[PDB]
Scaffold this motif. Structure first.
Motif, PDB file in Angstrom:
ATOM      1  N   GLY A  55      75.196 -64.626  47.379  1.00 36.78           N
ATOM      2  CA  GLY A  55      76.236 -65.376  48.065  1.00 36.78           C
ATOM      3  C   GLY A  55      75.815 -66.105  49.320  1.00 36.78           C
ATOM      4  O   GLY A  55      76.636 -66.377  50.173  1.00 36.78           O
ATOM      5  N   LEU A  56      74.528 -66.459  49.432  1.00 35.67           N
ATOM      6  CA  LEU A  56      74.006 -67.105  50.591  1.00 35.67           C
ATOM      7  C   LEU A  56      74.168 -68.607  50.435  1.00 35.67           C
ATOM      8  O   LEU A  56      73.950 -69.121  49.349  1.00 35.67           O
ATOM      9  CB  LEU A  56      72.515 -66.741  50.753  1.00 35.67           C
ATOM     10  CG  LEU A  56      72.277 -65.223  50.891  1.00 35.67           C
ATOM     11  CD1 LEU A  56      70.802 -64.917  51.100  1.00 35.67           C
ATOM     12  CD2 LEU A  56      73.128 -64.627  52.070  1.00 35.67           C
ATOM     13  N   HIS A 102      79.781 -65.667  55.750  1.00 33.48           N
ATOM     14  CA  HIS A 102      81.156 -65.720  56.271  1.00 33.48           C
ATOM     15  C   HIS A 102      81.779 -64.328  56.423  1.00 33.48           C
ATOM     16  O   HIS A 102      82.594 -63.921  55.607  1.00 33.48           O
ATOM     17  CB  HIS A 102      82.017 -66.641  55.392  1.00 33.48           C
ATOM     18  CG  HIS A 102      81.437 -68.018  55.236  1.00 33.48           C
ATOM     19  ND1 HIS A 102      80.524 -68.331  54.250  1.00 33.48           N
ATOM     20  CD2 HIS A 102      81.588 -69.143  55.979  1.00 33.48           C
ATOM     21  CE1 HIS A 102      80.173 -69.599  54.361  1.00 33.48           C
ATOM     22  NE2 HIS A 102      80.795 -70.111  55.410  1.00 33.48           N
TER      23      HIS A 102
HETATM   24 MG   LIG Z   1      78.611 -66.643  50.780  1.00 32.64          MG
END
Ligand SMILES: [Mg+2]
Ligand SMILES: COc1ccc(C[C@@H](N)[C@H](O)C(=O)N[C@@H](CC(C)C)C(=O)O)cc1
Ligand SMILES: [Mg+2]
Ligand SMILES: [Mg+2]
Ligand SMILES: [Mg+2]
Ligand SMILES: [Zn+2]
Length: 889
Positions: A55-56, A102
C-alpha cells in the motif's frame, strides 16, 4: 494463494546493514524517506531484488542516487517492488525511496496509524512493509537511524528506538527528533510514536552493573493519573528478571506508551513498548480488579521479551513459540512470585484446558511449531502461546530450578545477539539435562516431538497395591488421537509429578517425585508403602494432557479435602463435576430424545457437597481457590467430552446441578457473603495508588461469585444485598450488581445507574459494555440492539466492538438459539469489521471454533454462516484462510 513451508527456510541473497529513515508527518499524509545500505550475501544467485511494500505510494526510488524508472528497471504491484537483476549492483550499494502513506485512514491498525490524537506504529509481524520497502522478515537484522518530524503543537512528544541524539525546530510550527539505535534488530521491533503525551517517570538502578535506567510511562492527558500501577509493575518485572534469571536491562531508557486503538494487548518494541490502554491504565475508582492482574501480566510479559525475543531474536516466523511460549512461561513464573496466590497457576490451567484443548481438537489444530502458513497472523494462537508456555515449563519440571537456570543461561550466553530456533533452546536444555543426569549420552531428542506433534495427549492410569508386600504400582498409558497433521502419533516425554496420600491421615507418603514417562506405557513401582495410597497425579499440572485418574468419587473427595497440591485438589473437584455433568446430560438427552413424560435425574454426590461446605467454612483456605470449587467447569472444557453437544441440554444440566448444590449450601453462601464483606471491601488503601492486594481481590471474586449464585437462586431478600452492592466504590462490585440484577425487575434501573458511573472513562465504559453483553437476560437480543444504536454506533475501536459482542457469545442458552439468530448476528459483525480490520474480524470468529462439536442442527446453522462469510466478494486473505481451515475446505 501462497503457502510458506517451514522446511523451505533459506537465508536471503541480500543483506541490509543500515536503515536511515525520515518520517515527516503532515495533516493529510505522511512522507517516508528511507536509505538502505545493502550488500550481496554468500547465498545470492543473481536474483531480482524484491522488497516487501504494501500500500505504498511511490514518489521516487534510486540505487546509488540514480533514480530508477518504472517499467524499465522496476515494477510495483502494491505488494512487492521488484528491481530487475541487471539493475542491481554486485557489491555494497545504497537503495533509497520516498513513499507516501496515510496513518489517518489506516483502520487496520498495522503499519503506521492514528489512534485518537496519537500517531503510532505496529510492525509485528508484517507491518514494517506498510511504512517503507524492506525485506520484511526477522532474520534481516540492521542498524537504525530514525528522524521524525511533525507539527509541534499537535505532536510535542516524539519517540523511537535507541537514544534521542538531536531535537530541532523547523519553520512553519514543526519540530524534529533524531534517534540512533546502533545494536542490530529485526524490523518488526521498530517503533515510532508522536503525540501530546503526558508521563510519569522513575529511575531504576540495576542489580550488578548499577546502571541508572530512566523509566517513562505515557498516556493522553485525561488518563495520566491511571499510569502509576504500570510503573510499579515495570520495576517489579526488572527486579524479577535480575533475581531469578540474573538478567539486567541493557539500555539507558525504557518507555511504555498507552494507546486507545490496538489490535492486541501490547507490543515489545525495543525500549518503546506500546500497549492497549486496557493493559496499561488502571485506577481503584475507574477499573475492575482484573485490570490489576492484567497490567502486571502484560507489563511483565513485554519486559521479559527484552531477552527472550529482542536480544535473542527469531530466525523465521515458524519459531514464534520460542519467543511467545518462553515469554508466557517467564511471565507466569513472575506473576506466581508477585501474587503469591494459587489462582495464578489455576487460572492458566483453566484457560489452557478450555480454550487451547478446544483448538487442539478442532480443524484448526496445529503443533506449537507449525509446518506451513498462508497468513502468519493466524498463528498467534492459544496453542503457540499457552501450550508453548506449558512445553517451556516442562523443562523446569524435568530439570528442577538449579539445572533449569543453568540451561537457560546457556541459551542466553550462546544466542544473545542473534536469531535462534526451537532446536537452539532444546540444545541448551539438553546440556543441562546431561549435567543433571551425570552422563553425556543423555538426550532430549524425543522432547522435540512436543514442538512438532499436534493434539492433546490422553494419559490414563491403573493401580495395584499388595498389602503383604507393601508395594504399590502405577501403570500409565499415553495416547494422542490421529488428526490431519499426523496419521501416526508418537509417544512424548511426559513428566508426571506425583505424590501418594495416606487416606487414613492425609499425609505425604513419599518425597517429591517426577515420573518420566517416555514410552506408550510404563509401570512405576514403589516399595515400602505401608498402606494403599490415593495417588496425587500431575501435581502443578505437570504436562499439558487430558488426565484420566480412574479414581472413585470418594478418593477424589479425599484429595479435594486433604491433598497438598492446589492443582490436584482443583482437578479432583473438576473430575467429580464432570462425572455428574456427563451423567445428567445423558439423562436429559434421553428424556428429550424419547419425548418422555417423566424421568429421573441422578442427584449430586452428598459427600461432595459436604466437602464443598467443609472447605468454604475453613478460614485458613484461599478465597480464590474457594471461588473455583463452587463453579462448574467452563463450557469450553466440557465440550471436549461430549459428541454432538446439544447446548440447551447442557444448559439444563448445569442448572440442575447448581440448584442441587444451592438447595443444600445457599445459607452457607449467604453467611459467607456477609462475613467476607469487611475484609473484601476494605477501603483503608483505596487512595493509595500503589497498594495492591491480590488476596483481597480474590475475596471480592468469591463474594461476587456467591452473590451470582444466590441471585440465580432467588434467595430470600437477596435484592436488598444487590442494591447495596451497587453502592460500593469498587467497579468489580457495582458492575457485579448490574449482572446479578438481571434476574430482577431492577435490572434497567441498575443499567442506567452504572452507565452513568461508567460513561466518562473510556475503559470503564468498555467494562460496562462487557457486563451488559454477558447479562443473563431473556431480552438480550433487544439489549444488544440498543447498545449498537446508543453506544457502539460505527466505532472502529477494537476494544468497543469486542466488548459488545464477545461476552454475549458465551451465553450458552441465547447465543446458541436454535433459530441461528446469534450465529447470524456475529457473522454480520465479522463481515462488517473485515472491511477495515481483518485481524479483529478473525478474533470475532472465536465462537465458531467449536462448530463441528455441536448437535447436528447447530452444526448446520454455523456452517451456513461460515459459508456465507466465505462467499463475500471482498473477504480478506486473513479471514478467508481462517474460515477455509476451520471448515475443512
Ligand atoms: Mg497506501
Ligand atoms: C497477530 O499479530 C500480532 C502482533 C503483535 C503481537 C504482540 C506480541 N508480541 C505480544 O508480546 C503479545 O502477544 N502480548 C499479549 C499479552 C501477553 C501477556 C500474552 C497480547 O498482546 O495480548 C501479537 C500478535
Ligand atoms: Mg533488587
Ligand atoms: Mg495468567
Ligand atoms: Mg473511543
Ligand atoms: Zn509476547
Amino acid at each position: 494463494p501462497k503457502i510458506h513451508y517451514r522446511k523451505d527456510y533459506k537465508p536471503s541473497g541480500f543483506i541490509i546493514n543500515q536503515v536511515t529513515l525520515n518520517i515527516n508527518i503532515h495533516d493529510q499524509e505522511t512522507i517516508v524517506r528511507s536509505v538502505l545500505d545493502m550488500d550481496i550475501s554468500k547465498h545470492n544467485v543473481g536474483e531480482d531484488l524484491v522488497f516487501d511494500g504494501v500500500g505504498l505510494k511511490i514518489n521516487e526510488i534510486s540505487i546509488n542516487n540514480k533514480k530508477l524508472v518504472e517499467g524499465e528497471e522496476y515494477t510495483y504491484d502494491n505488494e512487492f517492488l521488484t528491481i530487475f537483476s541487471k539493475f542491481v549492483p554486485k557489491s555494497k550499494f545504497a537503495f533509497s525511496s520516498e513513499v507516501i502513506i496515510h496513518p489517518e485512514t489506516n483502520y487496520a491498525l498495522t503499519g503506521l496509524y492514528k489512534s485518537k490524537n496519537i500517531i503510532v506504529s505496529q510492525c509485528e509481524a508484517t507491518g514494517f512493509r506498510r511504512i517503507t520497502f524492506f525485506i520484511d522478515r526477522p532474520d534481516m537484522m540492521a542498524k537504525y537511524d530514525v528522524t521524525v518530524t511533525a507539527d509541534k503543537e499537535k505532536y510535542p512528544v516524539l519517540l523511537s528506538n535507541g537514544d534521542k541524539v538531536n531535537e530541532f525546530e523547523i519553520p512553519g510550527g514543526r519540530h524534529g527528533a533524531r534517534f540512533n539505535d546502533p545494536p542490530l534488530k529485526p524490523c518488526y521491533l521498530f517503533a515510532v510514536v508522536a503525540g501530546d503525551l503526558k508521563h510519569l517517570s522513575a529511575t531504576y538502578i540495576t542489580k550488578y552493573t548499577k546502571k541508572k535506567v530512566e523509566l517513562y510511562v505515557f498516556s493522553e492527558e485525561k488518563y495520566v493519573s491511571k499510569l502509576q500501577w504500570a510503573l510499579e509493575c515495570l520495576k517489579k518485572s526488572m527486579a524479577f528478571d535480575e533475581d531469578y534469571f540474573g538478567l539486567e536491562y541493557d539500555l539507558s531508557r525504557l518507555n511504555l506508551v498507552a494507546v486507545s486503538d490496538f489490535n492486541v494487548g501490547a507490543m515489545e518494541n525495543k525500549g518503546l513498548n506500546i500497549f492497549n490502554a486496557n493493559s496499561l491504565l488502571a485506577s481503584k475508582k475507574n477499573s475492575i480488579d482484573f485490570s490489576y492482574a492484567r497490567i502486571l501480566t502484560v507489563v511483565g510479559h513485554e519486559y521479559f521479551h527484552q531477552y527472550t525475543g529482542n536480544r535473542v531474536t527469531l530466525r523465521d516466523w515458524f519459531q514464534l513459540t520460542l519467543k511467545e511460549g518462553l515469554t508466557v512461561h517467564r511471565e507466569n513464573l513472575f506473576s506466581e512470585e508477585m501474587t503469591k496466590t494459587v489462582t495464578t497457576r489455576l487460572s492458566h490451567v483453566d484457560l489452557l484446558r478450555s480454550v487451547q484443548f478446544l483448538e487442539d481438537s478442532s480443524p484448526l489444530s496445529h503443533p506449537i511449531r507449525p509446518e506451513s502458513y498462508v497468513s502468519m497472523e493466524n498463528f498467534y494462537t492459544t496453542t503457540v502461546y499457552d501450550k508453548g508456555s506449558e512445553v517451556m515449563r516442562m523443562y523446569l519440571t524435568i530439570l528442577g530450578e538449579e539445572y533449569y537456570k543453568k540451561g537457560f543461561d546457556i541459551y542466553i550466553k550462546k544466542n544473545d545477539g542473534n536469531t535462534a530456533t526451537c532446536e537452539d533452546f532444546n540444545y541448551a536444555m539438553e546440556q543441562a539435562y546431561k549435567m543433571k543426569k551425570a552422563d553425556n549420552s543423555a538426550n532430549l531428542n524425543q522432547y522435540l516431538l512436543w514442538f512438532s506433534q499436534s493434539g492433546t495427549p490422553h494419559v490414563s492410569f491403573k493401580y495395584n497395591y499388595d498389602a503383604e508386600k507393601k508395594q504399590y504400582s502405577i501403570h500409565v498409558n499415553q495416547y494422542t488421537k490421529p488428526d490431519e497433521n499426523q496419521k501416526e502419533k508418537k509417544p512424548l516425554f511426559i513428566p508426571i509429578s506425583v505424590g501418594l496420600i495416606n487416606p487414613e491421615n492425609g499425609k505425604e507418603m513419599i518425597s517429591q517425585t517426577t515420573l518420566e514417562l517416555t514410552k506408550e506405557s510404563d509401570t512405576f513401582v514403589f516399595n515400602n508403602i505401608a498402606v494403599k495410597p490415593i495417588p496425587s497425579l500431575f501435581r502443578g499440572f505437570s504436562a499439558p494432557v487430558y488426565i484420566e485418574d480412574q479414581l472413585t468419587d470418594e478418593e477424589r473427595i479425599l484429595l479435594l479435602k486433604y491433598d497438598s497440591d492446589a492443582f490436584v485438589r482443583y482437578n479432583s473437584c473438576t473430575n467429580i463435576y464432570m462425572k455428574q455433568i456427563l451423567m445428567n446430560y445423558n439423562e436429559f438427552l434421553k428424556a428429550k430424545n424419547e419425548k418422555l413424560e417423566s424421568f429421573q435425574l441422578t442427584p449430586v454426590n452428598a459427600q461432595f457437597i459436604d466437602a464443598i461446605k467443609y472447605l468454604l467454612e475453613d478460614p485458613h483456605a484461599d478465597a480464590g481457590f474457594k471461588s473455583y470449587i463452587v463453579s462448574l467447569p467452563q463450557d469450553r472444557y466440557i465440550i471436549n467430552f461430549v459428541s454432538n453437544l446439544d447446548t440447551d441440554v447442557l444448559a439444563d444440566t448445569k442448572e440442575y446441578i447448581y440448584k442441587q448444590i444451592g438447595d443444600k449450601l445457599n445459607d452457607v453462601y449467604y453467611k459467607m457473603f456477609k462475613s467476607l464483606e469487611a475484609k473484601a471491601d476494605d477501603l483503608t488503601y483505596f487512595n493509595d495508588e500503589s497498594h495492591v492486594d491480590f488476596d483481597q481481590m480474590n475475596m471480592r471474586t468469591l463474594r461476587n461469585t456467591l452473590l451470582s449464585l444466590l441471585s440465580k437462586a432467588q434467595y430470600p431478600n437477596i435484592l436488598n444485598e444487590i442494591i447495596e452492592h451497587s453502592k460500593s466504590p469498587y467497579p468489580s462490585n457495582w458492575l457485579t450488581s448490574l449482572s446479578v440484577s438481571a434476574y430482577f425487575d431492577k435490572y434497567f434501573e441498575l443499567y442506567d445507574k452504572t452507565y452513568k458511573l461508567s460513561k466518562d472513562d473510556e475503559l470503564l465504559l468498555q467494562e460496562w459494555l462487557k457486563t451488559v453483553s454477558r447479562s443473563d437476560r431473556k431480552d438480550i437480543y433487544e439489549i444488544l440492539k440498543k447498545l449498537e444504536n446508543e453506544v457502539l454506533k460505527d466505532s472502529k475501536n477494537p476494544n468497543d466492538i469486542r466488548a459488545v459482542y464477545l461476552p454475549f457469545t458465551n451465553n450458552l442458552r441465547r447465543f446458541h438459539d436454535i433459530s441461528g439468530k446469534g450465529y447470524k448476528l456475529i457473522a454480520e459483525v465479522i463481515t462488517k469489521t473485515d472491511k477495515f480490520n481483518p485481524m479483529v474480524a478473525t478474533q470475532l470468529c472465536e465462537p465458531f471454533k467449536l462448530w463441528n462439536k455441536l448437535d447436528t442442527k447447530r452444526q448446520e446453522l454455523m456452517l451456513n454462516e461460515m459459508n456465507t462469510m466465505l462467499q463475500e466478494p471482498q473477504i480478506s486473505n486473513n479471514l478467508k484462510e481462517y474460515l477455509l481451515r476451520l471448515t475443512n475446505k
